[model samples]
Target: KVFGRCELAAAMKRHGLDNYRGYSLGNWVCAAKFESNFNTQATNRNTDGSTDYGILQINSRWWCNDGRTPGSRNLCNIPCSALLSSDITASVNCAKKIVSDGNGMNAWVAWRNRCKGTDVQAWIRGCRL
Candidate 1:
């Protein structure tokens, strides 16, 4: 499922990411827009052989076990495929853990490059949340 901007915002808000770790809902919405364009099944293979999975683009290198990424730590203790589900529950939870681990939203370079320090309110402007 591809989420619309406000739809994604509301979903993330439900997952406790609205003000999570000092990052705003717009920050996450903008990040996701760049990372995967709101496509739940998106995947990208890195030159290092690790793959990024799902809407928020969680990487298999350390977050989820893909059984293919060399020396994967699977910090989320979930299969990488779980990130691709349209439900997004697991994806959101894994992202929260990634932030909680102290990496902050910078764990996603797209967020750093495009979302950081920007007024992203437009991303959630139409959302009631």
Candidate 2:
């Protein structure tokens, strides 16, 4: 499922991502726009041969267990397929872990290149609540 811009913002905020670790809803929303275009089923294989899955593009190398990533740590203890689900609970939880572990938002290249240190509020403009 491809979420609308405002719909994704509302959902992320509801899940407690607003101002999470000093990152606003705009930061998350902006990165999601670049990372997966808000598509729940998105996947991108990395040059390291690991795959990134779901809306936030959680990586198989350290997060989800995809059974194909070489020596994956599976730190999130979740099946990769769960990240692709429309429910988004698993994906959002994994994203929190990525931040909680002190990797911060820099764990995502999309966020670094696109969302970091910018006036991201525009990404959430008119997104009530």
Candidate 3:
């Protein structure tokens, strides 16, 4: 059988998170769900404002000055895809560095709290990952 992006997202939601509040595992899953549907190869650009890329929806210009397209390689420099390929742990760790300024799990908790009350985290839990 083959798994699509949503399926993978659900899997990550199930095994990757530990709780449903604050910037904990629940928050990380919520962020990734909103960012890329847990698709490792996902990419997007802010057409109305700026260019963004990757699963974590990182903005290329924000992190790298090489322009959106090539600057995305900055994430690649972290060997992010290896994490993205299958292990949610790897992807979460990578996202932690990007979002939390290397605070890792702490960053995830903070971000998750930002999305609270929206029920996004609840949706993540319902998915049964």
Candidate 4:
């Protein structure tokens, strides 16, 4: 795991990702907890036939390249491998674009299920970031 919850909260806060696209850093961390648990190498295949990449678990259908996806529509124009790296600046930047493109936190299924409208602040509680 590239981050523990507290580490990620602090980093994200310092990166200016605390409040972005109508979503809180708490929401982002909660989703990461559920999606990848801060593992940069995390990958999962959704039954929708798309693969999720990196901490945010971005989908191949819209973001990162998918080795097996027949027509991977990588709107972010980066390799799937890039998202799997320890330095997450590229992936975080990609997430910003996705959020700005009307996806918001709703782009991540994990966020929709776990972080939406809940006490998302718990994800960053006591981290002091």
Candidate 5:
């Protein structure tokens, strides 16, 4: 499910992103746009055989249950598939834990490798919030 930009803004607001360190909804949306274009089901298998999950692009390296391999660390103790839901609450919760684990906004490679230092205001531009 690809949430409309404004809808994502509203959803994030409802989920309360105002206090997470270094994470404003703007960068999240921007990072998400580039990471997976807001598609909840988005995924990519990395060259290292890890997979990134959902809007936050969380790597299986230390996060959720990918249902294979081993030694995941499972910090969020969640199934990666849960992040692919349109509801998104699980993704949000897991993302909070991920950041708390010192991943921060930099968890999403796109955020650092691209969205970093960019004027993110336009990520919310033209959205009818």
Candidate 6:
């Protein structure tokens, strides 16, 4: 089954990024690994019963505005389902946009800088499909 949301996939394609699904997947995996250790349903909370949500562990209050409207405003806030929805592509595109607004792989560059010796551009370039 395809992971991520249909809306997400449509958004990525709408943004003219149809050829980078593998790159998106790799980035998603990396983001999940760093953010929540690949735990799609990870969450955190305060003693007040406030909640954080999903892999990437986006704080619902901060990022999703408590899900009062949408869980994720511009990006996909579909929660654990993000890993299982076709929108995973949109999540990647959202991350890329947030990181660099379509610049030279800013997230990858940052990851390489932090991790050292990881040529994210090359890796992404090699990732097709």
Tens digits of lDDT, candidate 4, 1-129: 579999988877776677887688898889888989899899888787888888878888878786678776888889887888877776788888888887677877778888899999988889865
Candidate 3 residue runs with Cα over 4 Å from true position = 1-22, 48-50, 64-90, 102-114, 124-129
Assess the local accuracy of residue 102 in candidate 6 as a C-alpha lDDT between 0 and 100. 48
Best by lDDT: 1
Ranking by TM-score: 1, 2, 4, 5, 3, 6
- lDDT score for residue 67 of model 2: 92
Compare candidates 3 and 5 on TM-score and give the better one. 5
Best by TM-score: 1
Those runs of model 1 whose alpha carbons end farther than 4 Å from true positions after fitting are none
lDDT (Cα, tens digit) per residue for candidate 5, span 1-129: 999888887787678764467677788788778888888999999887778889878778788889763666677898888889998888888878877767677777788888888888777778665
Model 2 alpha-carbon drift over 4 Å, by segment: none
What's the TM-score of each model vs. the native?
A: 0.96, 0.96, 0.49, 0.89, 0.89, 0.38
Model 1 alpha-carbon miss at residue 117, Å? 0.8
Q: Which digits, one per residue and each the tens of the lDDT, describe model 3 over residues 3-86?
A: 344455465456544443325454555565566665666656566444443455555544433243443445434442344354
In order, candidate lDDTs are 0.92, 0.91, 0.48, 0.82, 0.79, 0.42
Q: Which stretches of candidate 6 lie over 4 Å from their true place?
A: 1-25, 46-51, 67-128
Per-residue lDDT tens digits for candidate 6, residues 1-129, read: 222433323444465554453344344344444554544455566455445444444444333445443433524344433533433443444454444434433334334444334442332243333
Steric overlap count per candidate: 0, 0, 2, 0, 0, 9
Candidate 5 stretches greater than 4 Å from native: 126-129
Which residue pairs clash in candidate 6?
Answer: 3-85, 4-84, 4-85, 4-86, 4-87, 4-88, 5-85, 5-86, 5-87
lDDT of 6 at 112: 46
Error of 2 at 102 (Å): 2.1
Tens-place lDDT digits, model 2, residues 89-114 = 88888999998887699999889988
